Design a protein around this ligand. Structure first.
Ligand SMILES: C/C(=C\[C@H](C)CCCCC(=O)O)[C@@H]1O[C@@H]2C=C[C@@H]1OC(=O)\C=C/C=C\C=C\[C@H]1O[C@@H]3C[C@H]1O[C@@H](/C=C/C[C@H]1O[C@H](C[C@H](O)[C@H]1C)[C@@H](O)[C@@H](O)/C=C/CC/C=C/C2)[C@@H]3C
Ligand SMILES: [Zn+2]
Lengths: 176, 99, 1111, 49, 197, 49, 54
């Protein structure tokens, strides 16, 4: 009986649950069912938490963990010709208008950054990591520019004060 | 013949595949009847969804997060074991069972 | 007549009827009251079969008890089912989504045998759903209807076939029970009667006979005359009872070693021990009536017997002998003939009571196995019936029967006629019934035993034709499940008024006269030769001495909704079918005016559908408003009836109930007190009365198109209210808990004006497609940002706003006001499902006008969408200035054989203008058989032609000749029924007179706003990458196989490459197509489809090496 | 007993009248449309049918 | 009838040893996904149960062989593994089909191809397309023969990227994002652009 | 039409002649018999059922 | 009582797919018992484990 119960608790569910949580799930189900038979009313979560001497939020966590998944090959409609898996929207796909909007945003940002000088645009692109993935820090840009980091930081502050102008913001405001 | 499918084909040969072909297609041997960790919802190790066998779930990310961008691509994390690449190779890599 | 608040609707009916229409929900209500065991059913059964008052639960609990162990040392029994009061009333259940139910209680008794102890406990069996006042169930707040099912009854069904090689008749028999095994006694190409038992063919009859213990002497004695039986008794090649038993055991068992106690018990377990073979009381009555075994004995011992088996073999061999009648020793004689499987004496009706009893029995079996399991493993002198019984399989069986089973349907209600005909519906298919591929051509036919038991007209017209029909008007269900029909008995040519309800077999035994036969007003027939219906459905004339039964009325053979068609006897059958189907899909308008010309079946079919507030007890009105009426009874008491102002029906239509009594009137018990959705002064009203001309007008009314005036859009003649709901739920998640709030990130203050403080909208805000209803925000989690996003947030200074916005936006192409916000919560202690925190429902309501594209129809199957709404002045008017309203088409009338619309148009014009038959010198010759007070009528008067006895054509001519003028001296319509219209557009009169009149058309539920759809780029599928489907999602149309064949047959190949690569599956192709269109470049060359790649991976996973080769 | 095309079989008679001459004897047969479409040259159009 | 398959194995460069199977392959997981819904509810893909049964019985057979068991248990375990792989490849072929919850037979690998619901007759030959529409029809007797009517509320959704490019080109919007929002709000100039496109 | 394109043997299968010549008609018991005499040295073709 | 909107358990980013430079990497050659060879490209600064699951 030990081998049968342990092996059923291991290989019963499609998502594997350890045996102590399966034990408390079985205890919760038997407790709720017996209190329904002896009561005539299906009890409350606080009643079950009173009976099992645990907290009601733990009772809700257990009753959320106890739910087994559904299968994607069932008949959704009236007649059976439609699987469930044909009506699930793939949200991780490409929305295909925001991608081309991202491309146009990159080109617009290129135009706006190229309306300034060379040192400013280079420091900004190295600071925020546009030509490469990793953003260079102030010490890295001071190394690549032959200066200290304080001049780099003053250049950064002055350029960020420059870029908040409406002449450089009226085209980029609608991109957020 | 072709394997990257450049839409330049002239034949499509079917054939009865041997065990030497089966264990040549596969990337890793699945050896546990688990799918997903019940608590953190991550793919289990050596399961039917294992990220070492079938590839990573996140774009250019290993399992332990030690390599997390495109500059580490085409390498394998020496701790976790997931080859860091795009996450769309979970649609194309196969595994096998040794009976 | 005989309804206290009836409008005076004068009838053209020539002949009196004896029997009024029975209560139309009597099948549902009386079957459920049979199941419960209600005292009303108790006194009715005491009137009609008083020998055994047995309910459904009592029958199941008595076929269950007793329940013992294997040792027989302890027994558990059941007794006394008994209900309680319901836990909540109907409207509260529909509000808070609770199911309308009541608890079951059962007195259980556990008996120990050796020492002897009985233990009486009151076991709570479960929550049992209860039927409402109108025959509907309520499940989870929705409203459901259980449909009846037609199955073939148990018994013996003798039938013959030809063999088409030797061309000899090969008879057979199928002793088919309820819940048992089968057995067939065929006749082969030879004369060896094959006894294929449980579909294991061999072994002629001597095997079963000597297996029963019969010797060759007794086989010779009972079966001596039969050449077939003596040939088999010589070709038996087996002597000995045990010699037969070992053959039976080795062929039926095989895979088990035989022994002389197993074959001793196997046959006695299969067909006689009643734990495995219980043909029901229906089957016992059917077999005992078919062979004539017992006559007056009550129905008990529901298993078979060896007497019945040898009677079956004797009947079969005398049927192959070609005899006429047979008397088995021990019983009365019976005729010898083959049986049919489509006769209505063999198809019983499994109604709702038997349907719920079956699921309760299949729950009680699984409870019984658990109880008899734990009656051993539990220790003795320690058990109690509270510990024995597990009610979980019974409550799960009830729950799985009501929710998600194809005979427990979601009740449709777009009008009370469709509610009423959604009940009283017979379906031949379902669980335990044949599917549509097993449905042969023979079962869809109309057998001649359908006269008055099932309507031949009303049925669906898709692939389900003939499998679903409705009951007739006067039909009534037997106690056993057959369908009874009334008949007036005539004695010696004197038609009496006693009424005898007759099923199909007794309808075959006698001869039955016609409904509209000329009675001589004494009971005597006028002519000696009367039409009649013979046994097999033959139609003959007959001398009137032989006729012993007469129909109760015409329209007996027809359904409810088909009896509401005027002039049915002039139409065809297919267009009448389309009219009876399209009559129930009408929508409720805002005004709902009663029809001018109708039949007598509107008042009864409206007050019997339950959607009209009817005064329970008489008295006087105290107080009226738009919500509540309080009558004052004769003795002190008062009673408030609450209305339903704008409730949402089950399909998105309005459910108004306005009152129709003033504050001083006196109502009697049964008077209609408030209209319903589609009613006017009590009776049904599905549309409006519209002036119509039958000319073809400039190709706009071409090929079943209908044009209308602008007066219907202006004066709101055709206008329905539609109410939809939207539902969202704030629940917990892994990262936190979603909240309903005003602070939605990355949103302006423009869309946040209509929202109030707790996030939901106000009441009365007119919304458009894409506006915020419920402002809900989710915890987003941790994501990395693109550098452009990072420096843009640095440029504008705006923060991260780490929670993701997912509101409830009103979907595409919807608008209207916001009626009501019913918001539940967890903190206010409502019954919410596990893991949910806050549920909220918002009800949006729009007021749809009429529009071109909407589907209109008359009452004779003359459908057609609206072609063009003309303005008022370019619409052909009469010689009075009155414009016509709609213009039908001429060419659709004569080729469809439905001139009932032309007769209804003529009689409608007569009823609108009003007439006066000038009997100055005597009543004229056409109107000599008209009733009185039909010689003259006021304008806008109502009339009523019944179905098969109505206005004659000569009487229509005579009414249409004398048709008193409008306001001037002006008879606008001559004796032909036509008028001289003027062209409203050019100006000249039309050169020929044109038929006009007042028709009655209804607006169907096929509006355009539920059909028009488009898609540029929406969602996509999961496994494959195709776009999704249907208007519920965004979805795209299906470019199937035959359209690909057409595109190949054109020679157009590039469009096929387009539609099959870069619009459905080219995952890197779609975004390049979009970018190329936006930037203005050429479309790139496509690539391979992902569905083909999926095909390749599945073929590689089926151990098939598939290598794609370059060269 | 194997059904082969009239073009492929007659070309194989051309290859076999040389290099030692004997003809494979054949008589023309008439087959229905399900039987004809399944024995095509492509295993993709046949399996899709 | 025998020479057909024997010459089929003899002519090509094939071996008959591949009819038995020493290593089963696994389909990639994105063709049998475990997608979670909104609200934590999960959805398997009905091949995971067959794969899990094969994995379970294979591990148990390996443990029985390494443990050392009598012939009855090992023979029954090997026939169990054989039945599981046969049910994986074609459920309902030999004997009773393997049913899941609710007495529904599971969708095996061959059932992704067979019949009308397979890949061939459902998703390879006829697919759902984009840039599409559907509505009811009426008679238009003033049109010429090559013309057709069209509702503007439907043609505005059919021709959305064309009209987006065109009203970006005419300076009615700053970029594609405000142009798309302008189409969604249906401002009174988008019809004047819609006629041109 | 479906039995033509599928090339089944038909229901009302009427035999045809196989050679020129005169016939030997027989009206048998419940089913006839027809035999065709050839104009050459061949056996007379019999059609029984 | 909601809309069927699924999502696989994983995120999809999009960065610059450039192959002109990568991180420098070694290649370790692992060997099983049955005469098999395998190549696993680890990074340069990576403690290469003495065993490996092939
Ligand atoms: C095909 C079928 C039912 C169809 C869905 C509806 C009727 C088809 C005939 C027609 O085309 O008009 C069979 O129905 C049952 C057995 C199995 C079959 O169900 C089936 O196999 C198909 C579905 C079985 C249970 C479905 C439950 C849920 O499916 C939705 C919600 C739940 O119930 C359904 C409600 C259907 C009510 C219909 O009612 C009809 C009109 C509309 O088609 C519907 C409003 C009315 O004409 C009404 O008079 C007809 C009722 C059908 C009579 C009983 C038949 C037995 C709704 C479609
Ligand atoms: Zn790692």
């Amino acid at each position: 009986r030990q081998a049968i119960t342990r092996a059923m608790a291991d290989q019963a569910r499609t998502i594997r649950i350890p045996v102590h949580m399966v034990e408390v799930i079985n205890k919760l189900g038997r407790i709720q069912r017996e209190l329904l038979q002896d009561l005539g009313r299906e009890p409350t979560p606080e009643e079950l938490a009173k009976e099992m001497d645990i907290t009601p939020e733990k009772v809700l966590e257990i009753q959320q963990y106890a739910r087994e998944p559904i299968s994607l090959d069932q008949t959704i409609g009236d007649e059976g010709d439609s699987q469930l898996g044909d009506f699930i929207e793939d949200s991780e796909a490409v929305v295909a208008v925001d991608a081309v909007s991202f491309t146009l945003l990159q080109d617009q940002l290129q135009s706006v950054l190229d309306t300034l000088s060379e040192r400013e645009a280079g420091v900004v692109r190295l600071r925020f990591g546009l030509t490469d993935g990793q953003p260079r820090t102030l010490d890295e840009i001071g190394q690549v520019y032959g200066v200290t980091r304080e001049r780099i930081r003053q250049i950064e502050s002055k350029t960020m004060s420059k870029l908040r102008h409406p002449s450089r913001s009226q085209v980029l405001r609608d991109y957020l | 013949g072709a394997m990257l499918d450049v839409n330049f084909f002239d034949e499509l040969r079917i054939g009865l595949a041997t065990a030497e072909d089966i264990r040549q297609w596969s990337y890793g041997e699945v050896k546990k009847p688990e799918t997903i960790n019940y608590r953190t919802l991550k793919p289990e190790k050596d399961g039917l969804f294992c990220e070492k066998i079938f590839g990573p779930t996140r774009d250019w990310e290993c399992y332990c997060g030690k390599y997390k961008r495109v500059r580490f691509k085409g390498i394998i994390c020496e701790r976790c074991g997931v080859e860091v690449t795009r996450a769309k190779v979970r649609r194309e890599r196969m595994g096998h069972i040794e009976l | 007549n005989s309804v206290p608040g009836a409008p005076n609707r004068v009838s053209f009916a020539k002949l009196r009827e004896p029997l009024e229409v029975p209560g139309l929900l009597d099948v549902q209500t009386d079957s459920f009251e049979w199941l419960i065991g209600s005292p009303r059913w108790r006194e009715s059964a005491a009137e009609r079969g008083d020998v055994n008052p047995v309910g459904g639960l009592e029958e199941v609990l008595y076929e269950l008890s007793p329940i013992e162990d294997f040792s027989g040392s302890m027994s558990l029994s059941f007794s006394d089912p008994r209900f309680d009061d319901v836990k909540a009333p109907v409207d509260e259940c529909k509000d808070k989504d609770m199911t309308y139910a009541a608890p079951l209680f059962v007195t259980a008794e556990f008996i120990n045998n050796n020492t002897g102890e009985i233990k009486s406990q009151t076991v709570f069996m479960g929550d049992f759903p209860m039927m409402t006042e109108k025959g509907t169930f309520i499940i989870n707040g929705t409203e459901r209807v259980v449909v009846s099912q037609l199955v073939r009854s148990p018994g013996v069904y003798f039938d013959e076939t030809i063999d088409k090689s030797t061309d000899k008749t090969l008879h057979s028999v199928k002793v088919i029970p309820s819940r048992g095994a089968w057995l067939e006694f065929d006749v082969d190409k030879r004369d060896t009667v094959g006894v294929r038992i449980d579909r294991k063919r061999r072994q002629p009859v001597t095997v079963l006979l000597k297996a029963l213990g019969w010797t060759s002497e007794q086989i010779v004695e009972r079966f001596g005359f039969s050449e077939i039986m003596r040939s088999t008794l010589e070709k038996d090649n087996t002597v000995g009872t045990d010699e037969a038993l070992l053959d039976i055991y080795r062929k039926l068992r095989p895979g088990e070693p035989p022994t002389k106690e197993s074959a001793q018990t196997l046959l006695e377990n299969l067909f006689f021990k009643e734990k495995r073979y219980d043909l029901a009381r229906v089957g016992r009555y059917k077999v005992n009536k078919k062979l004539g075994l017992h006559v007056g004995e009550p129905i008990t011992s529901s298993t078979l017997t060896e007497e019945d088996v040898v009677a079956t073999i004797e009947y079969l061999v005398r049927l192959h002998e070609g005899q006429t009648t047979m008397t088995v020793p021990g019983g009365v004689e019976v005729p010898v003939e083959t049986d049919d499987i489509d006769h209505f004496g063999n198809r019983r009706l499994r109604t709702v009571g038997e349907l719920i009893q079956n699921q309760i029995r299949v729950g009680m079996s699984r409870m019984e196995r658990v109880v008899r399991e734990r009656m051993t493993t539990q220790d003795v002198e320690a058990i109690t019936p509270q510990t024995l019984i597990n009610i979980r399989p019974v409550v799960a069986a009830i729950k799985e029967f009501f929710g998600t089973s194809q005979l427990s349907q979601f009740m449709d209600q777009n009008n009370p006629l469709s509610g009423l005909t959604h009940k009283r519906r017979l379906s031949a298919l379902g669980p335990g019934g044949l599917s549509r591929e097993r449905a042969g051509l023979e079962v869809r036919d109309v057998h001649p035993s359908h006269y008055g038991r099932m309507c031949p007209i009303e049925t669906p017209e898709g692939p389900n034709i003939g499998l679903i029909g409705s009951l007739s008007v006067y039909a009534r269900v037997n106690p056993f499940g057959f369908i009874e029909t009334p008949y007036r008995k005539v004695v010696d040519g004197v038609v009496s008024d006693e009424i005898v309800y007759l099923t199909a077999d007794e309808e075959d035994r006698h001869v039955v006269a016609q409904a509209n036969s000329p009675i001589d007003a004494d009971g005597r027939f006028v002519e000696p030769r009367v039409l009649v219906r013979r046994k097999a459905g033959e139609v003959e004339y007959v001398p009137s001495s032989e006729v012993d039964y007469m129909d109760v009325s015409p329209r007996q053979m027809v359904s409810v909704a088909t009896a509401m068609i005027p002039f049915l006897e002039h139409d065809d059958a297919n267009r009448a079918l389309m009219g009876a189907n399209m009559q129930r899909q009408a929508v409720p308008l805002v005004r709902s005016e009663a029809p001018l010309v109708g039949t007598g079946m509107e008042l009864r079919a409206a007050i019997d559908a339950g959607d009209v507030v009817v005064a329970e007890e008489s008295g006087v009105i105290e107080e009226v408003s738009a919500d509540y009426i309080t009558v004052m009874h004769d003795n002190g008491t008062r009673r408030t009836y609450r209305m339903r102002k704008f409730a949402r029906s089950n399909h998105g239509t309005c459910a108004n109930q306005c009152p129709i009594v003033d504050a001083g009137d006196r109502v009697e018990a049964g008077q209609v007190i408030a209209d319903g959705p589609c009613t006017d002064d009590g009776e049904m009203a599905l549309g409006k009365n519209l002036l119509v001309a039958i000319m073809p007008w400039e190709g706009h009314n071409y090929e079943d198109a209908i044009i209308l005036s602008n007066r219907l859009v202006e004066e709101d003649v055709l206008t329905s209210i539609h109410i939809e709901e939207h539902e969202i739920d704030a629940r917990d998640t892994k990262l936190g808990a979603e909240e309903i709030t005003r602070d939605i990130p990355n949103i302006s203050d423009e869309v946040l004006a209509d929202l109030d403080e707790r996030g939901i909208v106000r009441i009365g805000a007119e919304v458009r497609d894409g506006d915020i209803l419920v402002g809900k925000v989710t915890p987003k989690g941790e994501t990395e940002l693109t550098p452009e996003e990072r420096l843009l947030r640095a440029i504008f200074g705006e923060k991260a706003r780490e929670v993701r916005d997912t509101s409830l936006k009103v979907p595409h192409g919807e608008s209207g006001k916001v009626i009501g916000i019913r918001v539940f919560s967890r903190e206010d202690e409502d019954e919410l499902p596990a893991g949910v925190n806050e549920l909220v429902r918002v009800y949006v309501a729009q007021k749809r006008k009429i529009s071109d594209g909407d589907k209109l129809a008359g009452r004779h199957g003359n459908k057609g969408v609206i072609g063009k709404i003309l303005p008022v002045e370019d619409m052909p008017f009469l010689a009075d200035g009155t414009p016509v309203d709609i213009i039908l088409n001429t060419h659709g009338v004569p080729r469809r054989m439905n001139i009932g619309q032309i007769l209804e148009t003529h009689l409608g014009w007569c009823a609108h203008s009003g007439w006066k038959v000038d009997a100055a010198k005597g009543v004229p010759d056409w109107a000599a058989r008209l009733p009185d007070e039909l010689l003259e009528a006021q304008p806008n008067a109502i009339v009523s032609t019944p179905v098969f006895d109505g206005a004659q054509e000569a009487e229509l001519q005579g009414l249409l000749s004398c048709t008193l003028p409008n306001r001037d001296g002006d008879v606008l319509v001559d004796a032909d029924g036509k008028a001289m219209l003027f062209d409203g557009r050019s100006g000249e009169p039309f050169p020929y007179p044109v038929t006009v009149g007042y028709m009655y058309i209804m607006k169907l539920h096929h509006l355009v706003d539920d059909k028009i759809h488009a898609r540029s780029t929406g969602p996509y599928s999961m496994i494959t990458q195709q776009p999704l489907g249907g208007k519920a999602q965004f979805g795209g149309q299906r470019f199937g196989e035959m359209e690909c064949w057409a595109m190949q047959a054109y020679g157009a190949a590039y469009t096929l490459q387009e539609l099959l690569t870069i619009k459905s599956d080219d995952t890197v192709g779609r975004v390049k197509v979009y970018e190329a269109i936006v930037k203005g470049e050429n479309i790139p060359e496509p690539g391979i489809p992902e569905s083909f790649k999926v095909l390749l991976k599945e073929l590689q996973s089926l151990c098939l090496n598939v290598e794609v080769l370059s060269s | 007993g194997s059904l082969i095309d009239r073009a492929e079989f007659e070309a194989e008679n051309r290859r076999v009248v040389a290099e030692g001459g004997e003809p494979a004897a054949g008589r023309p047969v008439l087959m229905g449309i399900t039987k004809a479409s399944l024995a095509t040259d492509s295993w993709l159009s046949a399996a899709s049918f | 009838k025998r020479l057909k398959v024997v010459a089929a194995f003899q002519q090509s460069g094939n071996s008959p040893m591949g009819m038995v199977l020493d290593a089963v392959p696994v389909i990639p997981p994105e063709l049998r996904p475990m997608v979670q819904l909104d609200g934590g509810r999960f959805a398997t893909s009905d091949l995971n149960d067959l794969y899990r049964r094969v994995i379970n019985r294979n591990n148990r057979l390996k443990r029985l062989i390494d443990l050392g068991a009598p012939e009855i248990i090992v023979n029954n375990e090997k026939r169990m593994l054989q039945e599981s792989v046969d049910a994986l490849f074609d459920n309902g072929r030999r004997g009773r089909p393997v049913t899941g919850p609710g007495n529904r037979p599971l969708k095996s690998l061959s059932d992704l191809l067979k019949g009308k619901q397979g890949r061939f007759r459902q998703n390879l030959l006829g697919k759902r397309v984009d840039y599409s529409g559907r509505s009811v029809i009426v008679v238009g007797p003033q049109l010429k023969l090559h013309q057709c009517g069209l509702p503007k509320l439907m043609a505005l959704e059919l021709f959305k990227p064309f009209v987006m490019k065109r009203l970006v080109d005419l300076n009615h919007a700053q970029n594609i994002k405000s142009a798309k929002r302008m189409v969604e709000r249906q401002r009174p100039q988008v019809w004047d652009v819609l006629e041109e496109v | 039409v479906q039995e033509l394109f599928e090339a089944r043997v038909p229901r009302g299968k009427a035999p045809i002649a196989d050679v020129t010549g005169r016939v030997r008609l027989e009206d048998g018991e419940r089913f006839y018999k027809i035999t065709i005499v050839p104009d050459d040295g061949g056996e007379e073709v019999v059609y029984d059922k | 009582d909601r809309v069927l909107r699924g999502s696989r358990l994983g995120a999809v980013s999009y960065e610059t797919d450039r192959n002109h430079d990568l991180a420098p990497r070694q290649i370790a050659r692992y060997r099983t018992d049955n005469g098999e060879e395998f190549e696993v490209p680890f990074a340069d600064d990576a403690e290469i484990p003495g065993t490996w699951l092939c």
